[PDB]
Design an enzyme around this catalytic site. Structure first.
Site, PDB file in Angstrom:
ATOM      1  N   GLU A  62       0.808  -1.217   0.079  1.00 48.16           N
ATOM      2  CA  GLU A  62       0.020   0.111   0.150  1.00 48.16           C
ATOM      3  C   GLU A  62       0.636   1.134  -0.122  1.00 48.16           C
ATOM      4  O   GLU A  62       1.820   1.304   0.715  1.00 48.16           O
ATOM      5  CB  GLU A  62      -0.932  -0.207   1.265  1.00 48.16           C
ATOM      6  CG  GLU A  62      -1.919   1.209   1.290  1.00 48.16           C
ATOM      7  CD  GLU A  62      -2.838   0.981   2.159  1.00 48.16           C
ATOM      8  OE1 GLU A  62      -3.019   1.065   3.411  1.00 48.16           O
ATOM      9  OE2 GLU A  62      -4.193   0.292   1.779  1.00 48.16           O
TER      10      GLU A  62
ATOM     11  N   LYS B 127       0.580   5.254   0.793  1.00 50.30           N
ATOM     12  CA  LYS B 127      -0.300   6.174   1.318  1.00 50.30           C
ATOM     13  C   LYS B 127       0.962   7.315   1.873  1.00 50.30           C
ATOM     14  O   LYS B 127       1.925   7.139   1.934  1.00 50.30           O
ATOM     15  CB  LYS B 127      -0.872   5.609   2.766  1.00 50.30           C
ATOM     16  CG  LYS B 127       0.046   5.361   3.820  1.00 50.30           C
ATOM     17  CD  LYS B 127      -0.408   4.644   5.121  1.00 50.30           C
ATOM     18  CE  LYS B 127      -0.885   5.919   6.287  1.00 50.30           C
ATOM     19  NZ  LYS B 127      -1.117   5.355   7.290  1.00 50.30           N
TER      20      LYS B 127
ATOM     21  N   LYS C 136      -7.961   2.169  -2.504  1.00 50.05           N
ATOM     22  CA  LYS C 136      -8.450   2.161  -1.225  1.00 50.05           C
ATOM     23  C   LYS C 136      -9.059   3.605  -0.747  1.00 50.05           C
ATOM     24  O   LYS C 136      -8.423   4.471  -0.453  1.00 50.05           O
ATOM     25  CB  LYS C 136      -7.052   1.626  -0.437  1.00 50.05           C
ATOM     26  CG  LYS C 136      -7.260   1.451   0.977  1.00 50.05           C
ATOM     27  CD  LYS C 136      -7.259  -0.223   1.295  1.00 50.05           C
ATOM     28  CE  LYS C 136      -7.404  -0.255   2.751  1.00 50.05           C
ATOM     29  NZ  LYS C 136      -6.191  -0.109   3.565  1.00 50.05           N
TER      30      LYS C 136
ATOM     31  N   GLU D 240     -14.356  -5.308   3.184  1.00 50.90           N
ATOM     32  CA  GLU D 240     -13.807  -5.084   4.389  1.00 50.90           C
ATOM     33  C   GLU D 240     -14.694  -5.176   5.679  1.00 50.90           C
ATOM     34  O   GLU D 240     -15.940  -4.521   5.432  1.00 50.90           O
ATOM     35  CB  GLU D 240     -13.349  -3.650   4.534  1.00 50.90           C
ATOM     36  CG  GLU D 240     -12.387  -3.387   5.869  1.00 50.90           C
ATOM     37  CD  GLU D 240     -11.836  -2.003   5.970  1.00 50.90           C
ATOM     38  OE1 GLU D 240     -10.880  -1.998   5.089  1.00 50.90           O
ATOM     39  OE2 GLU D 240     -12.047  -1.275   6.834  1.00 50.90           O
TER      40      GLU D 240
ATOM     41  N   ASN E 168     -10.386  -5.975   8.780  1.00 52.30           N
ATOM     42  CA  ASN E 168      -9.283  -4.573   9.109  1.00 52.30           C
ATOM     43  C   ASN E 168      -9.559  -4.685  10.749  1.00 52.30           C
ATOM     44  O   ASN E 168     -10.757  -4.370  11.018  1.00 52.30           O
ATOM     45  CB  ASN E 168     -10.009  -3.543   8.249  1.00 52.30           C
ATOM     46  CG  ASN E 168      -9.021  -2.074   8.884  1.00 52.30           C
ATOM     47  OD1 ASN E 168      -8.121  -2.339   9.498  1.00 52.30           O
ATOM     48  ND2 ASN E 168      -9.651  -1.062   8.107  1.00 52.30           N
TER      49      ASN E 168
ATOM     50  N   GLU F 127      -6.089  -7.324   6.224  1.00 53.33           N
ATOM     51  CA  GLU F 127      -5.883  -5.957   5.876  1.00 53.33           C
ATOM     52  C   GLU F 127      -5.125  -5.188   6.716  1.00 53.33           C
ATOM     53  O   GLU F 127      -4.598  -4.129   6.398  1.00 53.33           O
ATOM     54  CB  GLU F 127      -7.096  -5.113   5.626  1.00 53.33           C
ATOM     55  CG  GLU F 127      -8.129  -5.537   4.531  1.00 53.33           C
ATOM     56  CD  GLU F 127      -9.282  -4.757   4.647  1.00 53.33           C
ATOM     57  OE1 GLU F 127     -10.180  -5.394   4.513  1.00 53.33           O
ATOM     58  OE2 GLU F 127      -9.105  -3.416   4.165  1.00 53.33           O
ATOM     59  N   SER F 128      -4.860  -5.510   8.093  1.00 53.20           N
ATOM     60  CA  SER F 128      -4.236  -5.015   8.966  1.00 53.20           C
ATOM     61  C   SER F 128      -3.154  -6.019   9.549  1.00 53.20           C
ATOM     62  O   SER F 128      -3.306  -7.020   9.843  1.00 53.20           O
ATOM     63  CB  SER F 128      -5.094  -4.264   9.898  1.00 53.20           C
ATOM     64  OG  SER F 128      -5.982  -5.175  10.580  1.00 53.20           O
TER      65      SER F 128
END
Length: 266
Positions: free
Chosen positions: A54, A56, A116, A165, A186, A216-217
């Site tokens: 990802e 960001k 996202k 999600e 998540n 996702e995390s």
């Protein structure tokens, strides 16, 4: 009240401003003329634990978490390292992303791209497609069920894959009922960005083998990857907290090596 409510207020305002400039009809036409979506499901079916990496805005300027600031260069590092999919954060307020970052990433990589963001209305789905997204995040917590179903259907009709999600077992039940093919858990808190260690491990066993399960995390390196793989992750999304040491390519390559090892837990 919630951070999520503030993010969604923001999304509504930001989308309305864009729609004032580029109408729904115009964005539907732009989506229809865009280069076709890439095959996300094939990427996810590749053997081994896949890595979604990802892009960001915010990261530390030095130390073990230091990375590449420029979105195109970061995305290229991720592709070079063996990421199967590059995620790019386009939500503008909590995460300070932009649709411009999606454009930059899309032009820089030849692998699938996940947008996202916090999708609340169809405009955003056509917009994602027009700007080259292959995968689109949909968040159960943001949407009433009938709207979730219609956003999922629109995503699929356009030829994209939805990453649906969930944050709780009940949200996972809803995602399954909606028809999700790919369900992400998540466990991150939107204020702190800290991750609840028990959430994936609790939710994943309830997800049938017919869905692709994504952590996702919480995956920051091979040590976490092995734990999540053992808990049922088919792919992991990495970015926040990734131990990169100034070299995200190498960090992603190490994850790929671990996730494709024949003896990786599963």
């Amino acid at each position: 009240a919630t951070v999520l409510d503030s993010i969604l207020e923001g999304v509504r305002a930001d989308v309305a401003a864009r729609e004032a400039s580029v109408s729904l009809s115009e964005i539907k036409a732009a989506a229809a003329a865009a280069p076709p979506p890439l095959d996300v499901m094939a990427a996810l079916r590749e053997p081994g634990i896949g890595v979604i990496a990802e892009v960001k805005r915010a990261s530390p300027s030095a130390g073990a978490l230091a990375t590449i600031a420029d979105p195109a260069k970061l995305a290229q590092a991720y592709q070079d390292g063996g990421a199967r999919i590059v995620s790019v954060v386009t939500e503008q307020r909590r995460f300070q992303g932009s649709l411009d970052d999606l454009d930059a990433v899309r032009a820089s990589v030849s692998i699938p791209v996940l947008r996202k963001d916090f999708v609340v209305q169809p405009y955003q789905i056509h917009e994602a497609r027009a700007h080259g997204a292959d995968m689109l995040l949909l968040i159960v917590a943001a949407l009433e069920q009938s709207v979730l179903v219609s956003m999922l259907d629109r995503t699929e009709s356009l030829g994209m894959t939805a990453l649906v999600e969930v944050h709780t077992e009940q949200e996972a039940d809803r995602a399954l009922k909606a028809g999700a093919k790919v369900i992400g858990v998540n466990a991150r808190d939107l204020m702190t960005l800290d991750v609840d260690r028990d959430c994936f491990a609790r939710i994943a066993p309830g997800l049938p083998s017919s869905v692709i399960r994504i952590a996702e995390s919480g995956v920051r390196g091979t040590a976490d990857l092995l734990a999540y793989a053992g808990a049922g992750a088919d792919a992991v999304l990495v970015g926040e907290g990734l131990v990169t040491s100034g070299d995200p390519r190498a960090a992603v390559a190490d994850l790929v090596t671990a996730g494709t090892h024949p003896s990786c837990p599963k």
